[PDB]
Design a protein around this ligand. Structure first.
Ligand SMILES: Nc1ncnc2c1ncn2[C@@H]1O[C@H](COP(=O)(O)OP(=O)(O)OP(=O)(O)O)[C@@H](O)[C@H]1O
Ligand SMILES: Nc1ncnc2c1ncn2[C@@H]1O[C@H](COP(=O)(O)OP(=O)(O)O)[C@@H](O)[C@H]1O
Lengths: 909, 671
């Protein structure tokens, strides 16, 4: 703690002095012990026990002092409760160098992942999100004027909120001009979209629509006479047309995300105004309008948190103005509307939200979307054994202090005692929230507090606890309002997403693609790696949008609305699903595609550039290559699919029964990439089960606190350091062997978008863009869904590698590789003699097919018996060579050799 | 047979209100029997004829065997003052277990009030409550007073510690310890064994439920603000009572067992209060049409009473009830809370303005509450009584050398279960038929399960004579067989909860016979004959897959897309009526609560009106709005409405209305 940093001396000076004295005495004692390491000699030194106990109690007292300092640092800046004790020690110690601070900002704030400082790192100019979006403070804060970490971080947070408020005011000022007009100019609209953040743009659109609808309803007091609601709907349609025209062109990814968020929100507003408000509704106080989430902007208010008010039914909320960056916006389906209504009603009554339902219906996502709608920091606590008391208690304290939201992914996944303790803590917090709204004590004078960490903790009124289920504990039955989220509306989520992607026939495409995925989940066989859920559907939809845009770009460099959108959709579906399908399910998939998409066919990518280097590499490695229906067509298709998912993402996983062309596929792919792209390929084949987890990743010395890297970590560190220049070279870490939830725990943070290996010692390794982590496994039977979902996959069924391919490889190696020139001649003669028997319907194939029917003491595998047969034929050739050596005159003749090989083949079979 | 055929009052006896009172002398005995033997024979007859009166006949048998008024003491109120005075030692705690949603502290507090002995009532929710209760019990056992511990089911470990602590000698004899708690399995067994358990249940009835609701709500809340608040609260209480009494009829009336507890009632009351305050700023009475009816209906259909509703049909039923009750017509003198009640009688809305009149009207409700009050058919009570009698029989069986009987049962099962059906499938030609692939999967699954079951039964048989060794899997299987629970390794398809092994093997034999017929039809002509098969959805392991295969086949013929096909259902009289290019015959469908004539539904008192032959037609969707004279009836798999296969659109007769179909739980069943 006290020597890895330099700023620790200023924060805790007197404790630093006491520790220096303790360390001096300890070093003197250690030097005395070193001169006589004998146990009896050490024990016989004058007063070892007395000085040792003095050091022990002094170290204890300074440890409680440091803990108290950490607690006061947490109390001064409440967001410090989210980071750990070691993380806080690093933060306070490394306050001078902000580089070590930026690795924590994604844990305290919501969207903030870094801070933009000055040239000398003196003033915090602004904040930056994870996606690169930057918010510049209107009045930048200075670290030199407020050197203490907590005070300048609090100034940063307050200035963030103020800057968001001012930007919202300006964006609303612009969007009121945009809204009260027709035939919006695309240029000015796009400039406005680029000017403001995605959160701000969406919020401004919502505010403008809400005020417009409120004004229209107020002017319609008499009735339907002189109805401007039609004008509001026409304005929304015009804006949607402008956005749909804009998304069809080439846009930056950030502006693309802003455009699709705007399209989603404008589609929701169009649906609301077209039907839910135009059904003979003329009063602003009617519940048909009060039920909808209305936004009211009052820029005249001085306080930033009081400027914007979000109201749904009788519940009124103040926007928290927390920076969120660019978050994924859910399509507001009627189920999402019901979720918002129920959760807001629960929050108004100071209860909790328990949206129970089957996994994958968006309960946690809906809770997060509602929290982001009100601008509140939302924390999700996964209960899939990545759970702990020591973090959760202080996280609850932080939620109470700062006023953020806390959602549990699946509370029933918690173990019984852990579940009971967390239920007790949640009950305490929720009882505090309930007393916060006492009818007799509505004017809260004394602060409402709860008993967390055996101490009083102030509870912010804006916080909330959401417990997603799949029943609730008896403690929380009377405190949480349940909500059944069982069947998500996929035929609308797909439609809105396809419309945002630029598709002009989104409704038909959704009505075709949702039942098709239902059929795939039903008609196709049951496999562990199959995923036809809502996330897979959304991924396929974004891939289809990317494919359509790529086709538009290709056609332009050679309006353009005549594309076969169904063909693009099925091409995306195939490119995403076929690689992970067993050979039995491919005809079923194509039959389902024909059933749902009639007469629309899928043509693969030719890839003739790489499909010639593949042929050359296969020729020079004695393999068999063929295109499509020819022999080896399925294998080269699997190789090309492996190349496709290699391009798409890192963290591959080639699965298939033992005996398929798995290792050869990626070896040939690596060699073909090396010969084609000119980039040398190096592959590190690692068996994870051969060595222990400590040897695989490294171990931290219990006493010395010295870290020695493991095999995988050593490989990654070597690839990163670039002492030899392994960059500009394709590095492939192939994890040949079996996969279990034990050794892949540290790899989960690498396989996902983090690409980040966190070591126990603290050192963090970043995955370079030229490294792919391949999993060459066999069954995928003991792998958690977390690892499978994070990895692109190609399935190598046994039908991929036919027996004729094995025979051709064996004969080619016999004719080329010497079993050590006369030996080569003997091998070629033997191969010529035995070639007729190694045919499609020859003696060997029929004998093998029959032999599968017999009973064997061990499970008969095709390659085991084939390899034994090849070895014994090699020994037959060796015997022929030995006989020729024994008879220098009159060697083996062609008739005698023919008879000997013909009989030896039967003997070996 | 001859006895029932010759008798002519037997028919009118079958339809009597209480057949158990006058059971005809039907058994043939050479010598006169004792009254107990007569009771046994009449009980057997009641089990055969009109099993719903089995509970009443069991009561009569208990009266004839153990003496009349044996159960009369139970009907009297629990005078537990004598039980806390004597028959309970101070060492033994008095456990007051209540059904979830009920409170037992009232009785004990009242007996303390009349016995002028104070109780240190303590809630065990908080952690400080542990120390408070410890101090209270110490002081009360030193002095000799009484102590209470409310909601102790929340602290199981602390309950075990309390049980350990109480085991020591307790110096005072006037000490009594009461543990008010909820009936939960988390309570320790030792505490239950060491104390006197008292089970408290809420009395059944709409009147009792509404009285409890009105007593719970303070008078100040109801008598406040516009006078319409009292009527709104009365409507809310009636709605809560209706939806809570419909829960007792779990399959028919609410599908599942939702909570619908006091929390939902309090939330609804808060919503009513807030919205009536918002709409009515002043204390003056507001017009009934100015009540925010839409707000109340939406918030009590989507947030309160609706959050825990998952399937769409219970939500539809809840919306029907809310739109019927919460409307501006409720404030008129002609409003009818429930119609058709007891045939012609109606529950007229009371004409009151204050809480007192509504409470008096509640107290004047007649005791003769039929299920027609709730909107359910009156036969729901009969069905519930039959189910309760079946449960009683099951309990008596559960509370009742095995090698011989297991051997004979397994041999009889082997004779019953068909031997073996072979996979006659996987033809390269005509694989394009979705029906062929679906029946391939069904035949493969059925054959695999049949082989597994037959091998396991043969193993059990061989071990019955001890001709072979016994393994762990076999031990578990034979234990579940002797105990009567179906093996978990045998359940590869959807099975109704609590299905006996005999019923399971009979159903499996029927399914295997159907699959054999399917295989024979496929072998005889090919996949063309697969189309013209009157398959029964109940026999099929996954009927939804059959519906999907039907849709795919009808699309592939004529080359349509699956999105454009909608299901049209036509019920034909002939069990073998000719099918067109799109109709697939489906047999075994049973309609509950209604009868279909010429594809037109009509409400009926009789349940389970079997459908002769159901023709499932997939026609191209014409994109039209369905008329107001059709109903979307669910098609569940079995009598336990837990799995939804698909929905059917039937046209109703012009006399009835769809709301009555919705609230009577009319649905189609595969089995
Ligand atoms: N065109 C070909 N592509 C790949 N392998 C081929 C080809 N022709 C013949 N073979 C032979 O097929 C075998 C392929 O084995 P491979 O190393 O790909 O299997 P694997 O899945 O990694 O093995 P396992 O999982 O069983 O340990 C080799 O014996 C190889 O010689
Ligand atoms: N209304 C919706 N709009 C858009 N996407 C949704 C919606 N509901 C769910 N999803 C998607 O479903 C996926 C999984 O939902 P998730 O919240 O993980 O389910 P669960 O609540 O069971 O964990 C998410 O990636 C989310 O994008």
């Amino acid at each position: 703690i006290f020597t890895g940093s330099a700023d620790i001396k200023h924060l805790l000076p007197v404790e630093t002095q006491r520790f220096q004295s303790i360390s001096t005495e300890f070093l003197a004692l250690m030097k005395k012990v070193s001169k006589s390491p004998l146990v009896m000699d050490v024990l016989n030194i004058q007063g070892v026990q007395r000085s040792l106990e003095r050091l022990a109690d002094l170290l204890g007292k300074i440890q409680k002092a440091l803990g108290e300092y950490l607690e006061r640092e947490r109390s001064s800046f409440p967001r410090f409760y989210f980071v750990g004790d070691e993380d806080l020690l690093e933060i306070i110690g490394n306050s001078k160098n902000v580089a070590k601070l930026q690795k924590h900002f994604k844990k305290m704030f919501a969207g903030v992942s870094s801070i933009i400082l000055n040239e000398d790192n003196s003033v915090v100019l602004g904040i930056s999100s994870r996606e690169g979006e930057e918010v510049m403070f209107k009045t930048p804060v200075s670290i030199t004027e407020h050197p203490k970490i907590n005070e300048w971080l609090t100034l940063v947070e307050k200035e963030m909120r103020v800057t968001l408020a001012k930007l919202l005011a300006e964006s609303v000022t612009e969007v009121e001009i945009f809204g009260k007009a027709t035939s919006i100019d695309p240029n000015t609209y796009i400039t406005w979209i680029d000017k403001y953040q995605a959160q701000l743009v969406v919020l401004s659109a919502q505010i403008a629509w809400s005020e417009n609808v409120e004004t229209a309803l107020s002017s319609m007091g008499g009735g339907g006479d002189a109805a401007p609601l039609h004008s509001v709907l026409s304005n929304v349609e015009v804006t949607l047309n402008v956005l749909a025209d804009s998304v069809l062109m080439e846009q930056p990814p950030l502006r693309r995300r802003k455009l699709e968020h705007l399209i989603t929100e404008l589609v929701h507003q169009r649906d609301v105004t077209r039907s839910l408000i135009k059904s003979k509704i003329d009063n602003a106080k009617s519940f048909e309008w009060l039920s909808q989430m209305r936004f009211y902007f009052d820029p005249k208010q001085t306080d930033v948190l009081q400027q914007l008010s979000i109201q749904m039914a009788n519940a009124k909320f103040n926007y928290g103005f927390e920076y969120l960056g660019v978050q994924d916006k859910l399509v507001q389906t009627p189920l999402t509307d019901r979720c918002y209504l129920t959760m807001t009603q629960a929050l108004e009554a100071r209860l909790g939200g328990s949206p129970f339902g089957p996994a994958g219906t968006g309960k946690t996502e809906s809770v997060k979307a509602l929290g982001h709608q009100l601008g509140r920091f939302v924390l999700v606590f996964n209960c899939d054994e990545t759970f702990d008391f020591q973090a959760m208690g202080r996280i609850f304290v932080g939620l109470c202090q700062v006023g953020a939201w806390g959602c549990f992914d699946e509370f029933n996944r918690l173990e019984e005692r852990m579940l009971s303790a967390v239920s007790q803590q949640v009950q305490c917090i929720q009882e505090a929230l309930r007393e916060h709204s006492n009818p007799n004590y509505d004017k809260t004078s004394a602060p409402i507090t709860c008993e967390l960490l055996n101490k009083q903790v102030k509870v912010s009124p804006d916080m909330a606890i959401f417990i997603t289920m799949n029943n609730l504990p008896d403690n929380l039955k009377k405190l949480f309002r349940s909500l059944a989220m069982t069947k998500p509306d996929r035929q609308l989520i797909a439609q809105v997403m396809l419309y945002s992607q630029g598709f002009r026939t989104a409704e038909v495409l959704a009505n075709k693609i949702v039942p098709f995925f239902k059929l795939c989940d039903e008609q196709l066989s049951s496999q562990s790696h199959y995923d036809f859920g809502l996330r897979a559907l959304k991924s396929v939809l974004v891939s289809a949008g990317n494919v359509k845009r790529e086709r538009i770009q290709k056609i332009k460099r050679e309006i353009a609305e005549n594309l076969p959108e169904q063909e693009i959709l099925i091409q995306s579906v195939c490119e995403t699903m076929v690689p992970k399908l067993v050979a039995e399910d491919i005809p079923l998939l194509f039959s389902l595609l024909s059933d749902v998409f009639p007469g629309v066919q899928y043509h693969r990518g030719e890839m003739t550039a790489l499909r010639e280097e593949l042929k050359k590499v296969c020729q020079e490695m004695y393999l068999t290559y063929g295109d499509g229906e020819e022999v080896g067509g399925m294998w080269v298709e699997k190789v090309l699919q492996l190349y496709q998912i290699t391009q798409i993402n890192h963290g591959l996983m080639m699965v298939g029964p033992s005996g398929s062309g798995k290792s050869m596929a990626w070896r040939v792919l690596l060699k073909a990439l090396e010969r084609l792209e000119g980039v040398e390929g190096v592959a590190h084949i690692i068996d994870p089960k051969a060595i222990s987890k400590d040897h695989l990743y490294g171990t931290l010395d219990p006493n010395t606190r010295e870290w020695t890297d493991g095999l995988f970590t050593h490989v990654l560190r070597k690839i990163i350091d670039s002492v030899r220049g392994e960059l500009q070279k394709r590095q492939w870490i192939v994890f040949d062997g079996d996969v279990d939830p034990e050794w892949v725990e540290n790899l989960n943070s690498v396989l996902d978008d983090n690409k980040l290996l966190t070591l126990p010692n603290g050192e963090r390794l970043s995955l370079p863009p030229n490294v792919r982590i391949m999993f060459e496994v066999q069954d995928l039977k003991y792998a958690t869904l977390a690892t499978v979902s994070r990895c692109g996959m190609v399935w190598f069924s046994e039908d991929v590698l036919s027996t004729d391919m094995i025979f051709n490889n064996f004969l080619a190696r016999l004719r080329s590789i010497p079993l050590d020139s006369p030996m080569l001649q003997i091998q070629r003669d033997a191969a010529t003699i035995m070639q007729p028997y190694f045919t499609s319907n020859g003696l060997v194939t029929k004998a093998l097919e029959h032999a599968f029917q017999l009973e064997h003491i061990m499970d008969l595998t095709r390659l085991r018996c084939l390899g034994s047969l090849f070895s014994m034929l090699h020994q037959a050739c060796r015997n022929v060579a030995q006989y020729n050596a024994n008879h220098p005159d009159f060697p083996m003749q062609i008739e005698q050799l023919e008879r000997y090989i013909q009989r030896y083949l039967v003997y070996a079979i | 047979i001859a006895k029932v055929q010759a008798d002519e009052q037997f028919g009118i006896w079958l339809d009597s209100s209480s057949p158990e009172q006058t059971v005809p002398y039907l058994w043939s005995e050479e010598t006169p029997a004792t009254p107990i033997g007569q009771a046994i024979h009449r009980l057997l007859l009641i089990q055969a004829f009109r099993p719903d009166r089995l509970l009443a006949m069991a009561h009569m048998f208990v009266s004839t065997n153990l003496g009349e008024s044996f159960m009369s003491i139970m009907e009297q109120p629990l005078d537990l003052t004598h039980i806390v005075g004597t028959e309970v030692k101070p060492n033994t705690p008095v456990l007051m277990c209540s059904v979830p949603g009920y409170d037992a502290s009232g009785h004990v507090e009242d007996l303390a009030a009349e016995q002028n002995t104070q109780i240190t009532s303590i809630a065990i929710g908080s952690a400080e409550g542990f120390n408070q209760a410890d101090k209270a019990i110490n002081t009360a056992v030193k002095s000799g007073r009484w102590v209470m511990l409310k909601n102790v089911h929340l602290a199981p470990g602390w309950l075990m510690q309390l049980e350990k602590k109480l085991h020591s000698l307790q110096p005072h004899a006037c000490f009594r310890l009461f543990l008010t708690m909820e009936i939960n399995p988390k309570v320790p067994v030792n505490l239950l064994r060491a104390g006197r358990i008292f089970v408290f249940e809420p009395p059944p009835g709409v009147k009792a439920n509404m009285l409890r609701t009105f007593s719970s709500i303070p008078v100040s809340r109801i008598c406040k603000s516009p006078n319409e608040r009292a009527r709104l609260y009365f409507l809310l209480a009636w709605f809560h009572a209706i939806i809570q009494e419909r829960l007792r009829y779990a399959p028919l009336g609410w599908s599942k067992k939702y909570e619908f507890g006091e929390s939902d009632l309090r939330s609804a009351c808060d919503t009513v209060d807030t919205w009536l305050d918002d709409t009515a700023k002043g204390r003056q009475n507001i017009s009934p049409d100015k009540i925010p009816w839409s707000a109340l209906k939406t918030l009590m259909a989507q947030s309160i009473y609706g959050g825990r509703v998952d399937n769409e049909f219970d939500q539809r039923l809840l919306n029907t009830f809310l739109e019927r009750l919460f409307t501006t017509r409720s404030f008129d003198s002609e409003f009818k809370l429930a119609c058709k009640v007891d045939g012609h009688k109606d529950i007229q809305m009371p004409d009151g303005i204050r809480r007192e009149e509504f409470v008096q009207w509640v107290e004047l409700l007649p005791d003769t509450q039929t299920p027609s009050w709730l909107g359910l058919p009156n036969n729901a009570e009969r069905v519930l009584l039959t189910t309760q009698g079946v449960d009683m029989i099951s309990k008596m069986l559960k509370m009742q050398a095995w090698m011989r009987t297991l051997h004979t049962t397994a041999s009889n099962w082997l004779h019953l279960i068909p031997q073996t059906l072979s996979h006659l499938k996987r033809t390269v030609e005509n694989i394009k038929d979705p029906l062929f692939r679906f029946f391939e999967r069904e035949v493969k699954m059925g054959a695999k399960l049949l082989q597994d079951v037959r091998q396991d039964l043969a193993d059990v048989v061989q071990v019955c004579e001890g001709k072979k060794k016994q393994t762990n899997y076999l031990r578990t299987l034979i234990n579940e067989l002797v105990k009567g629970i179906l093996p978990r390794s045998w359940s590869h398809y959807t099975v109704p909860a609590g299905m006996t092994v005999i019923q399971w093997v009979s159903d499996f034999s029927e399914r295997i016979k159907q699959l054999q017929n399917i295989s024979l039809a496929a072998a005889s002509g090919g996949a063309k004959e697969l189309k013209n098969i009157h398959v029964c959805l109940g026999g099929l392991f996954v009927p939804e897959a059959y519906i999907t295969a039907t849709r795919q086949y009808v699309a592939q013929a004529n080359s349509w897309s699956l999105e454009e096909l909608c299901l049209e259902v036509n019920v034909t009289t002939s069990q073998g009526a000719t099918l067109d290019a799109c109709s697939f015959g489906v047999t075994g469908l049973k309609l509950q609560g209604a009868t279909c004539n010429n594809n037109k539904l009509s409400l009926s008192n009789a349940i389970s009106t079997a459908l002769p032959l159901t023709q499932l037609r997939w026609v191209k969707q014409t994109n039209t709005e369905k008329k107001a004279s059709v109903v979307t009836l669910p098609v569940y798999l079995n009598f336990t409405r837990a799995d939804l296969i698909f929905t059917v659109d039937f046209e109703i007769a012009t006399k009835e209305d769809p709301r009555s179909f919705y609230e009577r739980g009319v649905a189609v069943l595969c089995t």
